[PDB]
Amino acid sequence: RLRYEINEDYKVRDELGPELFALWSKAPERWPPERLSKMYGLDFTLVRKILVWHHFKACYDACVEPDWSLPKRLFALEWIRDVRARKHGLFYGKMRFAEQKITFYSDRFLFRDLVNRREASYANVWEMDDPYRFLQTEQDYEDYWGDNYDV
Amino acid sequence: MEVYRRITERVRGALWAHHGRLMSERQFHRILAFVYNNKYEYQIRFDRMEVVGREWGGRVEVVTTPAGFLKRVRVNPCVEDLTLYQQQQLILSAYANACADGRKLMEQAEMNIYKQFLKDLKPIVMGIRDNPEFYTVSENSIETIGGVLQTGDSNNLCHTHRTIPAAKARQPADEVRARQEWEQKWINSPRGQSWALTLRGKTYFALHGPQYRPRGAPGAKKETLPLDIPAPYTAMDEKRLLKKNWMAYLDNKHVAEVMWTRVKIADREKRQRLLQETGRAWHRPINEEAINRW
Amino acid sequence: FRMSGGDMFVEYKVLSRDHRRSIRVEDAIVDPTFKRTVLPLGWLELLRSPSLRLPTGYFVEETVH
Amino acid sequence: KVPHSLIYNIYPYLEEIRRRKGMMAMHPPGKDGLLMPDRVVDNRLPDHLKRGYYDDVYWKDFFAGSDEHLNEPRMGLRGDEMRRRLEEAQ
Amino acid sequence: DDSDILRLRAPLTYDMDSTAALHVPTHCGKASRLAGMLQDAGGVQVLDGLGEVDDKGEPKVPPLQSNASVPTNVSFYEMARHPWEDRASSWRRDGFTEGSLEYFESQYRSAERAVYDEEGRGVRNYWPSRDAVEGIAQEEENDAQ
Amino acid sequence: GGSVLDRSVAVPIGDSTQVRELFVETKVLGVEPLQSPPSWRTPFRNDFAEERLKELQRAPFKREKYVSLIQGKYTPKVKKFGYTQHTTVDDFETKEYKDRLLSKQFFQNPQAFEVVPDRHERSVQFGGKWEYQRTHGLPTVDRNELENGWSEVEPISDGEMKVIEQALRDISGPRPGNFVKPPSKTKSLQLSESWWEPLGYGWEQHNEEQKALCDVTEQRLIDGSNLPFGGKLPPFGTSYGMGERMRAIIEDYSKGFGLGPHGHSPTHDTIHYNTLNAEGERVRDLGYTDALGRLFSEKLGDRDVHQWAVESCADGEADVRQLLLSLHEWRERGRPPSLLLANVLSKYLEEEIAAFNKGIPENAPKLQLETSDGTLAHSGSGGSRSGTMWADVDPTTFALHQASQSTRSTRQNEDKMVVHVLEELSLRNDGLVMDIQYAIRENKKNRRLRWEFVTTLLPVFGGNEAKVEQLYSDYCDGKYVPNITVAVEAFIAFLHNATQHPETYSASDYFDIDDGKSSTASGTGDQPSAGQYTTLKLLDPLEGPFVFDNVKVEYIQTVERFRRHGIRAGPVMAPATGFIAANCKSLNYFTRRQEEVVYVTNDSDQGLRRSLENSAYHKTIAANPALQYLLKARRGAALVETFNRFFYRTMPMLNFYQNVLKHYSETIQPLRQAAKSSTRGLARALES
Amino acid sequence: YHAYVPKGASVQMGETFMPSNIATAVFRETEAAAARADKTKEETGFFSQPRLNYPVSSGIPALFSKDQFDMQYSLFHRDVVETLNRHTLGTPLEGHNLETVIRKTSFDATQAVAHTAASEHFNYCFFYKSLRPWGTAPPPRLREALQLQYGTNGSADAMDEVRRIVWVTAASHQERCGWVYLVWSGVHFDVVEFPHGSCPIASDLIPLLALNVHESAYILDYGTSGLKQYVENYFKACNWPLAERYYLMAIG
Amino acid sequence: FVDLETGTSLYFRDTRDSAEAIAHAADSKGIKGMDNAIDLYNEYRIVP
Amino acid sequence: ANRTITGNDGRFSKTIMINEPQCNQALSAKTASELSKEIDKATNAVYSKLSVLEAAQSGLTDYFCGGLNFEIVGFELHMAAMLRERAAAILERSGACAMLLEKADEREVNKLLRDASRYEDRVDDALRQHASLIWRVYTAPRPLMTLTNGKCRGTGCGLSLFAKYCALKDSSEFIFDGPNVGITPYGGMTRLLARPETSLKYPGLAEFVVLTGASLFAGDALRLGWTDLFTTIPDMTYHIKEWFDTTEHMHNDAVAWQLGHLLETCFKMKE
Ligand SMILES: [Mg+2]
């Protein structure tokens, strides 16, 4: 009764060996999620999910403890959206679709950001994708780290 | 991105067209991923250096990383007296000639990447055409339900090329083994003994000896025989799918077929354009029997 | 992070709390003989960004031997 | 119009717009990716030629029971395996 | 006058025609962005006699040179290469455990030189006895022992 | 280590005494800073002594058999890709890395490292609840060595690129089976499903194949009446959907793809193929058959195929099995006949082909068997080789069609020239001759080899390029080898013409040039170092004599790897070519006569020197400072090497044919033994 | 690209041998071709020439040079069709089968144009369909039929005898304008000679093989005295199995 | 959509100028943007 | 803000129409720099499968697009020349960026010169904005179809011909002139005329059109292979709109087919 599974192109068995583990082990900063995400023909949420699982499998394999901040780092936008949603509608959990705003944007709504992105420039590639480019104001840093009482 | 993905789809499609082999989506994407990461590496190293564009005389100087980023601008006090508009245009044109030099560099780099990529495709591509069963017919020969009809004209103009020695197989592997046989033959000779003490010799041993790489040093530590993936003799993704679920089989073979068709259409478009440029073809269909009469 | 002469060299980026102002340092010794990290006094005014939560740039400003 | 809820889908697109600067935007000079066929290639061989063609690369009698790769599917076969075919036939 | 049309072909300087060169795509994207980039670079620097040549021809305030060169060690295919065999390809192959493969190949070799010439005469026989075909290798038993 | 970072550690050379007594020459270059050697070149930071002791203690184990302790296990175990268990590659793992890693792993859990493990349970942790921040991941390599230390990549040339993309544009040409899939290849569907086997899917096709091509003693016939739906596809709304998904699978698997004769997909919107079975009828009235096929089946008549084969081969002619095989594959399963079968049929059927060819007008297609061109594909000859109207026909369909015709019942020996050898060998090696001939063709196509031959032999005759061209074409076939006299004065003429105006012959024929950037003390190597011609350079592998496109890439890589690093061996070294002796008036190579052919060796010389010095050009050549090294070298073999190299790069095919005859005289008698033995085999088998 | 390349031209690989002059002359020929194609699209009538099942870019093997066959196909036959179209429009015969034109114009002097053109159209068609390029060996069943009639105590004597009677019939038609058919009367075989502008369907026979005895057929190759050689070659190139399946369909 | 051949030519419109698609001056080589697949599995979903 | 450029948006399609019937559709520097905004903001929009640029003409004008407005350019060039004149007049009146020995004269000379250079800066801006506009059309990320209805002067020629989808109606026309107004042609069409293709098909045509100001029409632009597309259908723009209203998905398979089918059924001349 369990015999078939959707999406046969990527099997869980084959993702047990994590990809390019002999590289991003040795300098995990030079390896943002993008470089690896070009490997999978799936959508965004799925491939980031998979990358998280890779990191964890790798860690358990090498007998060291995994970065638990990693899921928060890859999903950072989703993290902050959930934090601010939780503060807005007063609840604890993860925001689901029914509770999204009903605003209807115009067709060309993204233009300003589009020309801002298209014309961006970066000194090195680390600046291009650092994990923290999501954050500008202090409110951003206060929402991103509220979890670790250390930070 | 584009130039690569076109060639990779060429490979996948051709792989299924000529033999019944499917390439795993996993594999197809991981090729491209390797190209991408190559480019990324070249970027990493490209940002450590700077390119200097210069406008009028030397009195407008612009220092910019080849990626087009701007680091410094030096200017003569002469410039300061112009106009805001002309100052802007001047600096902008210096920046442009900087981006030009940088882009020249990068384009050499990219040519290099393309070469490495091709070299990595070669065991697959030459995997499919180097078999005793592989063949092609000319594109202008009619195809009918039994088989393919003979092109009539210029019985001199059709030459069938053959990639394989028809007598006993000599594979690329035998050639590499021949190369290291000659390496050792040269080294172990007296004249080679004296050569191995030269600077040329030690350059050769530093680049191309892997065997002497100390434990933990980057790079391959043995010399590798060239990969052999003979296409009709190696089952790849179709057998796993056929065992597991028929539906994914039909879908993946469908994808390969579609890609092959698409590639072929592209080749027809390029052919058509090259035919029009040289004036043998008109700009609208003038011959409709070549289409409607089937 | 790189090695020479027996010790570590690390690049880092110093920043105010609101990340308005910043300074890069290329090769810094990682030395665990310092209980607390030391900077040149001049940077104190360079790194002071008086935000809303910290009306004066810093939360703690005192004098130590 | 675009619903507020569905905009996240545009993100990866918008992302590699931002990230396309530098080498990732670069295409190989001279190469379009569209390679037209020019010549005609056929490597096919008469059966007696391919009987021992792959003996050195692989074992002898490489094409043995292969129906697609041989015009005579039964050649090179030892008697037993020849008998098997009829055995399942009757 | 012909010399005047000869003059037209010369590239644009700012000394003659007082206009900067056009180069179009950079002007298209970055024209409105320039103030930003400039102030990111900490403004311009007004120096003195940048492109101004001295008495004997030497540059006054020596000009800035580009360090840029095409890096030659950077192939990624040898950076991440096959996990056990050292090959530089991108091709994913599931190999067999070394030492499985060795044993396997050994017993095959034995079995086949057992079938094809059973009497060790040395020539290939396509009509083998029923005892040599369905017969088990004694090497297996000997290995158990 | 190839690298910028790969320099060694500080090493001792002794006091002033031992240093002056060590070094002979010392040349200095400007001061630049000291880079610390990387971690893997550093002996104290890299010591593996513990692990090497572990290897050695386990070393006697490595010398015994591998034996499964499950007896009756044969199949190998699969090791999958990317599993941590199986990774052998250490990129940066030094003793340093292995120790940092060891320690981190130990403080993760200690109970992994105990021989008898105690209970392992998680306790609190001293850094905080977030301590993982200060702990996690694997030890990190220093980023300087990550970035900079990597080997120097071996430069890929444009030659190997053009080869690869040639192979890339070879595979993009169409295969004849894909647009309209033959009903023969669409019977092959098998699913692992429990509903697929009960209904024999391709049963009517498979039945047809069996009945037509197989003897009734051995055939299995599927009956549709007993099959689930009556061996059919059920009417639409009846079958609960079994039938519909049946149809879906079939229509999806049987669909064609790629481009058809009208240049479009089979599924294209407005334009269609096979309208009203217009192609079906086009096969009906044409049919697939050779003219040669029916001429043969006419002359042979009734009598036994095998009998005919024992006849058409006398004992020493050819293996009967070979032409039996090729005949079977040609008659049914219609194929192009192998040049073996074509030679046999040529000397068998000559009067029927003569009679078929005797009336034809001038500009109309004749019927001819001549294999002078390497390849067998009968799209290559214009279809005029056999009587075929088709480029290709898939075997199964051909066999069905011709079986729908009721004809068959289903229910001096010593001295040889090169031409003599190829026509004799044409019977006993199909493939070898096929190769020689394909190669000959490709060499005839090069403009480059032609231009070399021409411009080399022009000065000797000095005359008509008509005679030189003729001699070129005759040289191609082995019908001409140059006389050694002519050879020597051609070489001389070359040195002259290349010296007097250097521009043409240093931009076309290549000499290696001296690098004054490199200076050491030797008498040969100094004349190699400044302002001289070091070596005579052979043609690049793209413009050279023929090599197949399997190996062309590796051939290229090897040529470059060897030229760059100054390796003299393999394809770079030129084989010594033979010529016709001075006293001998013979035009060609012969299998038996070895004294007609003369080699110019280092030790035994052909008078190249005495012919050089006594030549009228000796002083104008002595003028060139660059040639002075190739004239006089420590190795007196400079002249011999220049000579042999010259005639290899100019006239490659002398060595080609020389090796052909070499091989012939080597392997011929084994082949005659095989032939006679097999033929007599079928002979006594036949009469018995 | 097939649609865009004109009717005659062959689409091939550039060898870069073209000087700019002839390279321009070609484009001009293509422009002209486009113009004449636009006018032939409107000159198109009801009937048209048959598509050939076999490539004639080179000659028909053992029979015709390229120029011979293309002087039949693209010269005489297409004229016949232009005539046929001119005279079947504006008449009661508009838009009917080739048959119902042949059969309803039979034996009348007034419609002789329509009938002649029609029957020539059919003859040429059937002639093209009667030629298989490398020839074929006559099938067993047809040989059995023919033998029962023509054969006198010899093996497939019927084949030599039929290809003799065809020769004789051809030589015995003096005018050199017409056709020779091997046909089935419905009760027996025979070889009939039709004059120009006459057809086997008009006489209600069933045609098996066609041979073109017009002098315009063999003139460029075999000259004026070469008819015997011509026929002899025709049998090297003829199509028997067609004749057979027509015979068997006629019988049932 | 895919079955009807129509519109597949449009992936390849850069071929319309031969000396350009070699030169790569324009960054748009593809239907929706920079290349034919930038994001295949993401973009299209923005339609309700 | 100037009501110079106007637009019509369907669900999946976008119409940008240039409205300047008075000066014969000759774009100013401001209006061009504006068009390069509306074009790429229409083209980089999320839902646009096709962005159609055409000329909005109430029947006053038969031009699709003019060149630079030569009246404006001529005007301010003349002004600049006049200011150089006065400045030279007073420079040689006192002689009987200019540094002098008198403060009043330095004052007014420098004021004059500065204003002159500002004028010239406006001309230069005009040229740069037109050229960059052409580039914008050339590099448009999503498909931009330029319907050419009526005549084009030089930079207008550029604007219509370099869109990857450039359609010609019967009324379409190209005038590359301006050696007749005493200037060298602009708009990049020079490139098209110099392609080795044009030298093959029509040797000499390049000199004919560049020297002699001479009009090329739809047939000539088709034979030269400057564009693939031509149509005779009334009010094509409406039909494009309503066709892309009935379309459904955004996946590039769908888009490719919808656009392609549109092209084949109308703009390619099959029938
Ligand atoms: Mg904004």
Q: What is the DSSP string of G207-241?
A: EEEEEE--HHHHHHHHTTT-HHHHHHHHHHHB-HH
Task: Spell out the alpha helix ranges (H) of F73-172.
Answer: 95-108, 143-147, 158-170
Q: How far apart are CA I39 and CA I33, in angstroms?
A: 10
Spatial separation of the C-alpha atoms in residues B168 and B49, rounded to whole Å = 53
How many angstroms separate the CA atoms of I157 and I148, rounded?
Answer: 9
CA atoms within 13 A on the CB side of F127: 10
| H/E segment holding residue B246 | helix B246-277
d(C-alpha I159, C-alpha I53), whole Å: 10
Is-contact I239 I15, C-beta < 8 A?
A: no
Do E51 and B58 contact (CB within 8 A), yes or no?
A: yes
Six token digits for residue F633: 């070298």
Distance CA(I138)–CA(I159), nearest Å, equals 8
- Integer Cα distance of I162 and I140 in angstroms: 10
Angle at the Cα of F363 (from F362 to F369), degrees rounded to 5? 80
d(CA G50, CA G30): 25
Beta carbons of G65 and G59 less than 8 angstroms apart? yes
What residues are paired with C9 via a beta bridge?
C2, C29
Q: Which tokens hold the place of F321? A: 């099995």
Q: Is F415 left (phi over 0), alpha (psi -120 to 50) or beta?
A: beta
Burial (Cβ within 10 Å: 0-12, 13-18, ≥19) of residue C38: exposed
Helix (H, G, I), strand (E, B) or coil at I174: strand
C-alpha distance from I16 to closest chain G C-alpha (Å): 34
CA distance F376 to F565: 42
CA dist I153 and I25 (Å) reads: 10
CB F188 within 8 A of CB F38: no
* Contact (CB<8Å) B40/A14: no
Residue G90 contacts B, CB cutoff 8 Å: no
Distance from the I200 Cα atom to the nearest Cα atom in chain G, whole angstroms: 6
- Using CA atoms, how far apart are residues F468 and F455, in angstroms rounded to an integer? 9
**Sheet architecture: strand order including B60-65:** B51-55, B60-65, B69-75, E45-46
Looking up tokens 């009846």, which residue turns up?
A: F238
Query: E139: number of CA atoms within 13 Å, CB side?
Result: 16
Rounded Cα gap, residues G114 and G199, in angstroms: 13
**What are the φ and ψ backbone dihedral angles of B39, each rounded to 5 degrees?**
-55, -40
**Bridge-based pairing state of the strands D2-3 and F390-393:** unpaired
How far, in Å, CA of F120 to CA of F101, rounded? 20
Q: CA-CA distance, G117 to F382, in Å (whole number)?
A: 36
Taking the C-alpha atoms of F242, F247, F249 and F254 in order, what is their torsion angle to the nearest 10 degrees? 160
* Closest by CA position to B284, among listed I192, H18, I194, G37: G37
Distance from CA of A138 to the nearest CA of C (A): 6
Q: How far is the CA of A113 from the centre of ligand 1 (A)?
A: 6
Contact list in G for residue B144 (CB cut-off 8 A) is none
Q: Is B204–F261 a contact, with Cβ atoms under 8 angstroms apart?
A: no
Cα–Cα dist G61/F383, whole Å:
10
Chains E and C lie in contact, requiring 3 or more CB pairs less than 8 Å apart: no
C7, two tokens:
């010790």
Q: How many CA atoms lie within 13 A of D32 on its CB side?
A: 23
> In Å, how far are A18, A49, A150 from F133, measured between CA atoms?
22, 21, 10
> How many helices and strands, by DSSP H and E, does chain G display?
10, 3
Residue B51's nearest CA partner among B69, B70, B67, B64 is B64
Classify the C-alpha dihedral B181-B186-B190-B192 as positive or negative: negative
- G88 is written with which tokens? 């079947």
F554 at B interface, C-beta within 8 A: yes
Residues whose CB falls within 8 Å of the CB of residue A61, separated by 6 or more in sequence, listed in order = A18, F84
Residue F587, helix vs strand vs coil: coil
The answer to whether A85 and A75 are in contact (CB under 8 A) is: no
- The β-bridge relationship of strands I13-18 and I50-55 is parallel
Assess contact for B41 and E76: CB atoms under 8 A.
Answer: yes
Read off the DSSP letter of residue G64.
Answer: B
For residue D23, what is the DSSP state?
G
Q: Produce one character per residue of A72-95: b if its CB has 16 or more CB atoms within 10 Å, e if not.
A: bbbbbebbbbebebeeeeeeeeeb
8 A C-beta contact, residue C59 and residue C53: no
CA separation, residue D89 to residues B66, D85, F187, F191, F399 (Å)? 72, 6, 18, 21, 21
C-alpha Rg value of chain H to the nearest Å: 13
Please report where in the chains the tokens 């008078």 appear, as a residue.
F607
CB pairs under 8 A between A and I: 19
What 3-state class would DSSP assign to F237? Answer: helix
| Cα–Cα dist G118/G99, whole Å | 9
Backbone angles phi, psi at E138, to 5 degrees: -75, -15
CA–centroid distance for E143 within its chain: 48
Give the integer Cα–Cα distance in Å for B124 and E90: 11
Q: Where are the beta strands (DSSP E) in F234-298?
A: none
**Contact present, G121 and G113 (Cβ < 8 Å):** no
Q: Would you give the distance in Å from CA E135 to the centre of its chain?
A: 53
φ, ψ of residue F13 to 5 degrees: the values are -120, 145
The token duo for A95 is 């925001």
Q: How far apart are the first and last CA of chain H?
A: 19
Let me know if chains B and I touch, i.e. at least 3 Cβ pairs under 8 angstroms: yes
Residues 6 or more apart whose CB falls under 8 angstroms from that of F112 comprise A63, F105, F106
Assigned token pair, G226:
């070469």
The residue whose two tokens read 């062959």 is: G10
Nearest C-alpha neighbor of F471 from the set F486, F492, F485 = F486
CB proximity list for B153: less than 8 A, separation 6 or greater? G10, G55, G57, G58
The answer to whether the beta carbons of residues A11 and A4 sit under 8 Å apart is no
Rounded CA gap, I103 and I111, in Å? 12
Q: Are B175 and F554 in contact (CB under 8 A)?
A: yes
Q: Tokens representing G91?
A: 């008449």
CA nearest neighbour of F37 among F101, F99, F94: F94
Q: What is the dihedral of CA F677, F681, F683, F688, to 10 degrees?
A: 150
Beta bridge partners of B54: B61
Q: How far apart are CA F408 and CA F417, in angstroms?
A: 43
Contact G27 I201 (CB under 8 A): yes
CA A31, CA A24: separation in Å to the nearest integer? 6
Q: Which residues in chain D have Cβ-Cβ distances shorter than 8 Å to E116? A: 78
Integer-rounded Cα Rg, in Å, for chain B is 28
DSSP G134: T
- Supply the angle between the helices G112-129 and G78-88 in degrees, to the nearest 10: 140
* CA dist., res. F395 & res. F377, Å (int): 14
Q: In 10 A of CB B147, how many CB atoms?
A: 22
> What distance in Å separates residue F220's CA from the closest CA in chain D?
5
Nearest to residue B186, comparing CAs of F560, F562, F526?
A: F562
Taking the Cβ of residue H33 and every Cβ of chain I, the question of whether any pair is shorter than 8 Å is answered with: yes
Phi, psi (5° rounding) for residue B52?
-115, 110
Give the integer Cα–Cα distance in Å for G55 and G10.
Answer: 13
Q: Rounded to 10 degrees, what is the CA torsion of B153, B156, B158, B159?
A: 170
For every residue of F547-582, DSSP letters joined together read --TTTHHHHHHHHHHHHHHT---GGGSPPPPEEE-S
| Chains near G (3 or more Cβ pairs under 8 Å) | B, F, I
Q: Which residue has the tokens 């939780």?
A: A86
Question: For residues G217 and G231, what is the distance between their CA atoms, to the nearest angstrom?
Answer: 11
C60 in F contact zone (CB under 8 Å): no
Q: Mention every residue, 6+ apart, whose C-beta is less than 8 A from residue H45.
A: A43, D6, D9
State the DSSP code for B135: B
F582 vs F596: CA distance, rounded Å: 9
Contact B220 E67 (CB under 8 A): no
- Asked whether the beta carbons of residue G11 and residue B272 sit closer than 8 angstroms, the reply is no
Question: Considering Cα of B30, then B33, then B35, then B37, what sign does the dihedral take?
Answer: negative
**Determination technique for this PDB entry?**
cryo-EM
| Cβ-based neighbour number of residue F562 at 10 Å | 21
**Which 3 state secondary structure label does DSSP give C59?**
coil
> Which residues contact residue E121 at a Cβ distance below 8 angstroms, ignoring those fewer than 6 apart?
none
- Test the H interface: residue of D1, D9, D14, D31 with most H CBs within 10 Å: D9
Residue D71 and residue E77: Cα distance in Å, rounded? 41
Give the single-character DSSP code of G50: P
Residue in A61, A60, A79 with CA at minimum distance from that of residue A69: A79
Between CA F292 and CA F297, with CA F296 as vertex, the angle to 5 degrees is 115
Contact D27, H29 (CB under 8 A): yes
Q: What are phi and psi of H10, to 5 degrees?
A: -75, -20
Residue with tokens 């070129």: F472
Helix ranges restricted to H, G110-181: 112-129, 140-147, 157-172
Which residue blocks in D21-74 are alpha helix, DSSP H? Answer: 47-50
Distance between CA atoms of I154 and F144, rounded to whole angstroms?
A: 56
Amino acid residing at B187 = I
- CB-based contacts of B32: which residues, under 8 Å, 6+ apart? A38, B4, B5, B8
Distance from C-alpha of A150 to C-alpha of A142, rounded to nearest angstrom:
13
Q: d(Cα F123, Cα F137) in Å, to the nearest integer?
A: 20
- The answer to whether G179 and G210 have CB atoms below 8 angstroms apart is yes
Please report, as a single letter, which amino acid is at residue G15: E
- Which tokens go with I2? 């100037």
At D26, the amino acid letter reads M
> Bridge-partner residues for B140, per DSSP?
none
The answer to whether the CB atoms of F76 and E81 lie below 8 A apart is no
In angstroms, the CA G167 to CA G171 distance is: 6
Q: How many CB pairs under 8 A join F and H?
A: 12
Q: What is the DSSP letter of F596?
A: S
* DSSP type of residue F112: G
Task: List C-alpha distances in Å: F397 to A1, E106, F151, F160, G245.
Answer: 43, 43, 56, 41, 19
- Eight-state DSSP code of residue F582: S
Which pair of structure tokens corresponds to residue I124? 């230069």
Contact status of A114 with chain D (Cβ, < 8 Å)? yes
Whether G12 has its CB under 8 Å from any CB of chain I: the answer is no
Q: Is the dihedral of CA F28, F31, F32, F33 positive or negative?
A: positive
Give the pairing of strands I144-148 and I165-168. Answer: parallel
What's at E5, amino acid-wise?
I
Question: Rounded to 5, what percent of chain A is helix, strand, coil?
Answer: 50, 0, 50
Q: Compute the distance between CA of residue F147 and CA of residue D24 in angstroms, rounded to an integer.
A: 19
Token readout for I22 is 């008075």
Q: Is E75 left (phi over 0), alpha (psi -120 to 50) or beta?
A: beta
Query: For chain I, how big is the Rg over CA atoms in Å?
Result: 22
Q: Is F656 helix (H, G, I), strand (E, B) or coil?
A: helix
Could you tell me the strand order of the sheet in which C2-4 lies? C2-4, C7-15, C22-29
Integer Cα distance of D1 and F322 in angstroms: 75
Residues of A in contact with F108 (CB under 8 A): 63-65
Element (H, E) at D40: strand D40-41
Question: How is chain F split among helix, strand and coil, in percent rounded to 5?
Answer: 45, 5, 50
C-beta atoms surrounding B235 within 10 Å:
12
With contacts defined as CB-CB under 8 Å, which chain B residues touch H5?
A: 261, 265
Resolution (A): 3.3
Q: Is G170 helix (H, G, I), strand (E, B) or coil?
A: helix
Q: Assess contact for I210 and I194: CB atoms under 8 A.
A: no
